């Protein structure tokens, strides 16, 4: 409803144009002729004139406004005619000769799918019932044979693509002659240019890191034009997000003269947060790169899931598929697709993202160096997010991106990289929470704690390990006799120890009592960032050992570091003590999950992965499935 | 009120510590032994134990708190035992010693000027009714011969020093043995360790750009210590502005282990953004580099200001003292002190403001590369702000930033520096707002717009140019037979022309056209931006000729580009028709000032400056009067 002031005058008649949509202003007093006490308006069937505080009294007070029914077939063909008259001179007119146009920008605003005609304009508000555009980057390659992501470009060199883009309609209906005086142009702020791209669709490029602003060829008459927009950034510390785009009106009909704004509209549109998945949601493919992989398979057969590996010459070594990257997605009113943040740690699999995974409808992202300077909770086992909570009346139904680090900065301290923390706060969609790992060697947060479906309460628990929980199994295991019981039997080259012999170990004792203050610590934290109950926490049997440093271990194959798919369970295989044929504590664990209706398998991973200092979940990856909610309707 | 987990165990006696504002939790079930139903608390009476959902049965859903009346004289003086007990069994005791210890760091989180102890923790909330500690960049220098601020030192090299930093205190009170096992360590995270520093009172340096932690030395028993924080940058895109320093507990008393951390508790401050003051505010000192500087020295004094000159051999041929600089100021509830912001455009002035002004209680900031890549737009000329101002039920106390630029991006459009521009968003107290002042040969939004004090409705007044104000002058001037009428005269070289001739020059008149048009525009976008009605406008005559790629020049001498103190107006001598010995439009004008009880001087800039495209206004400066509203009340 942004307008213009007229100011007429009884010299001579004035000429003026009206968009639709927009509230035009009147100036009678400024050039009302002396001797005049009052005045009058008259004007033709189209023009919807307005005055407020018949004839009326001259006040510079008294407010007169314009508005118009329809679009003008001709140059200047409503008019509106303004009479001063007083008490002993008769009336002296004023005329203006008004053209309505039709000028409509129109993006899908209503996050409905839609394009909509441009409502509290130029703001983009959160929530169900908040407004403006979302922008997908192009983070994947459709070009059948490409190296790159699709926005280095500057061209649209697919179908397909257009898809992903953003579209952008603009609807103009004018007098035939119109744009012989005045011309439209459509542009970006500098400071966002290198952010967008827009695309003419007849498809050439208006818009983009290099232009500002570009000058549109439009004809007279009723016309529409489709613009298609890519976003070529995400959300990050010096980017908040935003993208606006502006249409202008300039009035040529000067040739001695600079171009005058006549009328300036925009939209605004959102660029998609990279989003994690929890364990909670269903999976769809699983990655991992013999004894295992079948295992591994018939378990993610039983899930319903495709497989893919990849091969030694690739990898060069490398057998954690977890540590290198990580697979969210971008969402979009129109478009939905998995994105995969690629870890800048770049040891094996360092290719494998940028290669094997990213192409057609699969994006791809990354942060950090990449030269070096680089820690290992750096690498994505020390990535996670719980599944949707709502803490202390404040919902999170993307759930809460958890990452592991140190409780002080040291000189001995380590911590993920600032630009990857930078990165997970700009998408705000799930507010970071930092945990301690940094006492664990690896330090990966997926080391001591996971999340589980559950068919009650939340919906989900939360498994953290417990030396405790182990520690008492064995106890009653050896008051009912079995204290001679051999952990760790089964293994070709191992030192086998029995239930007493541990038990009895009082330095085995300091490590898991100080390794419980650590999950403790982390423990209370959950409860508070998450919200959660006790009821919400399972304890798993696990048991610890400082090393390097002091710094953590697994005692014994690591099972709540474990491969969930649906409630079809990945859990590494301890080698408990063998008791009625039946591992202790597999046994305690399933008494534990089963409960919950998942089903818990064992893979061995021990000469290849624990005595690596790694587990099941870690050689392993899945991308799993979007969540219902839009993002967008959050109110973070 | 953030706790730990206590589990307790009947095997053995547990030791734990309890800090004072500590809620802490028990673990009953984990280890209560078998063949016990139920248990019962008995505690030492410094203990209050609050257990929810006398005797109890044993549940893991029933929940026992623990909090304490005071802090301990002596490691474990106060005691918890728990009695596990069941219908055949005698009850099997578990014993808890507790130390309880009082550590509560405090700042002015109140913003009342006083410090307190640590309430809805851990975030900075806006408004009367929010929290959280101010904190302000040293920006002077107090040391009486340095040529740096004062925060490149790492040291404090003053008394007066400590009263811009912000006091920090850490209060103790523990059993006497208690840091033989435990110990303190004060940190920030290394990202924003840059952004700080912190100095220890007995004056040491903690924390800093080099150093996130620090070890404290505390002795046993009550103790108080004294920290003071400075901040090291104001906000910016990549700075948000707060600071979190916190305060960890550490048990040391395993040398075998790791230090476990207890406790830990945290403060947050909000570094004091930049802040300009409005010509509606009272004014302190005046500033410019012989007809001229005694009209001003008259003004100043009658409007009660301190003056300060810059000789030639400083200035090397500059005389626009507005242009390079812009006096604001910071504000914290213990300090207020003016900062002076330095443009880049760096000509003749540049020494003066990192030399002259800057010193004792004057602060000093700066944006851009410096180095060359500049504008015009980039002078203060451009930068301006309104008067405290409501728009739509938003309210802008501190008033809103205005600064021109163009209506589209293009090649031969000038903008300011992107670095300002996100600077005076990031303090977000006045919401930066955009004007087009590019239609400008010069491009300064003082040239067509001022503010003045008013005694009614807003309390104010804007001025805008209004050049057909001034042809409807000329005109009725005209009328009454005056049309004969010499402009310029007066003046031993010019070209004097009268008012008939003028008026019938018609591309004169296209000009102003054209420039009304741009004004107008100007117009509607401070009455959306500022809430502003017609009543709240009062239009200045004046003229202007476009000459350069059409860029808009002053006819005669600008007027609404004027000196304001207080009420003692520093208008720009036209020099125009006069009649009855008088000019018409100085009359003109004071018509309407004068009515405001404002009083209006005409100084003559001409061959000084009208002749060299600036004014009054431009070739001056002041500093105003911090406003009494506290920033961090409102709620941007
Ligand atoms: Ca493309
Ligand atoms: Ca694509
Ligand atoms: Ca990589
Ligand atoms: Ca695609
Ligand atoms: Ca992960
Ligand atoms: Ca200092
Ligand atoms: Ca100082
Ligand atoms: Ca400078
Ligand atoms: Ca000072
Ligand atoms: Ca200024």
Same mark, same amino acid.
């Given at each position: 409803a942004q307008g213009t002031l007229i100011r007429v005058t009884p010299e001579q008649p004035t000429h003026a144009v009206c968009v639709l949509g927009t509230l035009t202003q009147l100036?009678?007093?400024?050039?009302?002729?002396?001797?005049? #006490?009052?005045?009058?308006?008259?004007?033709?069937?189209?023009?919807?004139?307005?005055?407020?505080?018949?004839?009326?009294?001259?006040?510079?007070?008294?407010?007169?406004?314009?508005?118009?029914?329809?679009?003008?077939?001709?140059?200047?063909?409503?008019?509106?005619?303004?009479?001063?008259?007083?008490?002993?001179?008769?009336?002296?007119?004023?005329?203006?000769?008004?053209?309505?146009v039709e000028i409509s920008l129109c993006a899908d605003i209503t996050r409905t799918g839609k394009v909509k005609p441009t409502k509290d304009q130029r703001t983009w508000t959160w929530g169900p019932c908040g407004q403006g555009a979302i922008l997908l980057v192009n983070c994947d390659r459709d070009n059948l044979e490409s190296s790159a992501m699709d926005c280095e470009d500057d061209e649209v060199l697919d179908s397909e693509d257009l898809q992903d883009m953003s579209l952008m309609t603009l609807s103009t209906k004018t007098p035939k002659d119109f744009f012989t005086n005045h011309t439209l142009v459509l542009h970006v702020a500098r400071s966002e240019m290198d952010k967008v791209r827009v695309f003419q669709a007849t498809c050439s490029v208006v818009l983009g890191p290099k232009w500002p602003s570009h000058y549109l060829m439009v004809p007279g008459g009723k016309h529409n034009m489709d613009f298609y927009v890519?976003?070529?950034?995400? &959300?990050?510390?010096?980017?908040?997000?935003?993208?606006?785009? #502006?249409?202008?009106?300039?009035? #040529?009909?000067?040739?001695?003269?600079?171009?005058?704004?006549?009328?300036?509209?925009?939209?605004?549109?959102?660029?998609?947060?990279?989003?994690?998945? @929890?364990?909670?949601?269903?999976?769809?493919?699983?990655?991992?790169?013999?004894?295992?992989?079948?295992?591994?398979?018939?378990?993610?057969?039983?899930?319903?899931?495709?497989?893919?590996?990849? &091969?030694? *010459?690739?990898?060069?070594?490398?057998?954690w598929m977890?540590?290198?990257? *990580?697979?969210?997605?971008?969402?979009?009113?129109?478009?939905?697709?998995?994105?995969?943040?690629?870890?800048?740690?770049?040891?094996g699999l360092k290719e494998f993202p940028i290669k094997r995974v990213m192409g057609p409808d699969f994006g791809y992202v990354t942060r950090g160096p990449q030269t070096?300077?680089?820690?290992?909770?750096?690498?994505?086992?020390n990535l996670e997010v719980s599944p949707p909570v709502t803490v202390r009346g404040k919902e999170y139904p993307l759930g809460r991106i958890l990452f592991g680090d140190s409780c002080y900065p040291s000189n001995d301290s380590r911590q993920m990289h600032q630009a990857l923390q930078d990165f997970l706060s700009a998408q705000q969609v799930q507010a970071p929470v930092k945990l301690y790992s940094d006492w664990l060697s690896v330090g990966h947060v997926d080391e001591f704690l996971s999340f589980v479906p559950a068919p009650d309460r939340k919906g989900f628990r939360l498994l953290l390990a417990s030396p405790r929980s182990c520690y008492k199994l064995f106890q009653e295991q050896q008051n009912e006799g079995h204290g001679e019981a051999l952990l760790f039997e089964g293994i070709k080259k191992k030192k086998q120890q029995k239930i007493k012999n541990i038990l009895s170990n009082k330095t085995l004792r300091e490590?898991?009592?100080?390794?419980?203050?650590?999950?403790?610590? !982390?423990? *209370?934290?959950?409860?508070?960032?998450?919200?959660?109950?006790?009821?919400?926490?399972?304890?798993?049997?696990?048991?610890?050992?400082?090393?390097?440093?002091?710094?953590?271990?697994?005692?014994?194959?690591?099972?709540?570091?474990?491969?969930?798919?649906?409630?079809?369970?990945?859990?590494?295989?301890?080698?408990? @003590?063998?008791?009625?044929?039946?591992?202790?504590? *597999?046994?305690?664990?399933?008494?534990?999950?089963? @409960?919950?209706?998942?089903?818990?398998?064992?893979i !061995?991973?021990?000469?290849?992965?624990?005595?690596?200092?790694?587990?099941?979940?870690?050689?392993?990856?899945?991308?799993?499935?979007?969540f219902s909610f839009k993002w967008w309707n959050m109110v973070p």
């Amino acid at each position: 409803a942004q307008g213009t002031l007229i100011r007429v005058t009884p010299e001579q008649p004035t000429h003026a144009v009206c968009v639709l949509g927009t509230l035009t202003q009147l100036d009678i007093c400024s050039s009302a002729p002396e001797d005049c #006490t009052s005045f009058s308006i008259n004007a033709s069937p189209g023009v919807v004139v307005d005055i407020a505080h018949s004839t009326w009294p001259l006040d510079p007070g008294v407010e007169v406004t314009l508005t118009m029914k329809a679009a003008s077939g001709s140059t200047g063909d409503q008019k509106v005619q303004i009479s001063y008259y007083g008490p002993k001179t008769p009336p002296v007119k004023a005329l203006l000769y008004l053209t309505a146009v039709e000028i409509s920008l129109c993006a899908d605003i209503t996050r409905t799918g839609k394009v909509k005609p441009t409502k509290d304009q130029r703001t983009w508000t959160w929530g169900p019932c908040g407004q403006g555009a979302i922008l997908l980057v192009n983070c994947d390659r459709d070009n059948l044979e490409s190296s790159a992501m699709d926005c280095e470009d500057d061209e649209v060199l697919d179908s397909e693509d257009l898809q992903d883009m953003s579209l952008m309609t603009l609807s103009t209906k004018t007098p035939k002659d119109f744009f012989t005086n005045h011309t439209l142009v459509l542009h970006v702020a500098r400071s966002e240019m290198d952010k967008v791209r827009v695309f003419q669709a007849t498809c050439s490029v208006v818009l983009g890191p290099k232009w500002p602003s570009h000058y549109l060829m439009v004809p007279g008459g009723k016309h529409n034009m489709d613009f298609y927009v890519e976003a070529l950034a995400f &959300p990050d510390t010096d980017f908040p997000g935003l993208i606006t785009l #502006t249409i202008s009106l300039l009035d #040529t009909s000067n040739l001695e003269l600079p171009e005058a704004v006549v009328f300036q509209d925009s939209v605004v549109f959102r660029v998609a947060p990279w989003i994690m998945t @929890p364990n909670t949601q269903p999976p769809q493919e699983v990655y991992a790169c013999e004894d295992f992989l079948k295992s591994v398979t018939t378990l993610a057969m039983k899930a319903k899931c495709k497989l893919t590996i990849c &091969p030694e *010459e690739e990898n060069m070594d490398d057998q954690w598929m977890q540590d290198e990257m *990580e697979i969210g997605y971008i969402q979009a009113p129109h478009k939905t697709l998995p994105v995969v943040f690629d870890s800048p740690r770049n040891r094996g699999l360092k290719e494998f993202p940028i290669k094997r995974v990213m192409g057609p409808d699969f994006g791809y992202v990354t942060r950090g160096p990449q030269t070096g300077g680089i820690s290992g909770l750096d690498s994505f086992g020390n990535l996670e997010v719980s599944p949707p909570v709502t803490v202390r009346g404040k919902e999170y139904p993307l759930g809460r991106i958890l990452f592991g680090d140190s409780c002080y900065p040291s000189n001995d301290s380590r911590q993920m990289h600032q630009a990857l923390q930078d990165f997970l706060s700009a998408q705000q969609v799930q507010a970071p929470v930092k945990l301690y790992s940094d006492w664990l060697s690896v330090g990966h947060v997926d080391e001591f704690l996971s999340f589980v479906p559950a068919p009650d309460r939340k919906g989900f628990r939360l498994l953290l390990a417990s030396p405790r929980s182990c520690y008492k199994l064995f106890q009653e295991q050896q008051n009912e006799g079995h204290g001679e019981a051999l952990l760790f039997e089964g293994i070709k080259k191992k030192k086998q120890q029995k239930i007493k012999n541990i038990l009895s170990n009082k330095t085995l004792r300091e490590h898991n009592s100080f390794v419980e203050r650590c999950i403790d610590w !982390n423990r *209370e934290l959950l409860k508070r960032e998450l919200g959660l109950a006790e009821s919400d926490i399972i304890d798993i049997p696990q048991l610890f050992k400082l090393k390097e440093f002091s710094k953590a271990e697994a005692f014994f194959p690591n099972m709540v570091n474990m491969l969930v798919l649906g409630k079809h369970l990945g859990i590494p295989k301890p080698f408990g @003590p063998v008791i009625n044929g039946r591992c202790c504590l *597999e046994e305690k664990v399933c008494s534990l999950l089963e @409960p919950l209706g998942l089903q818990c398998t064992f893979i !061995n991973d021990f000469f290849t992965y624990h005595i690596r200092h790694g587990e099941v979940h870690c050689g392993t990856n899945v991308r799993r499935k979007p969540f219902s909610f839009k993002w967008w309707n959050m109110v973070p």
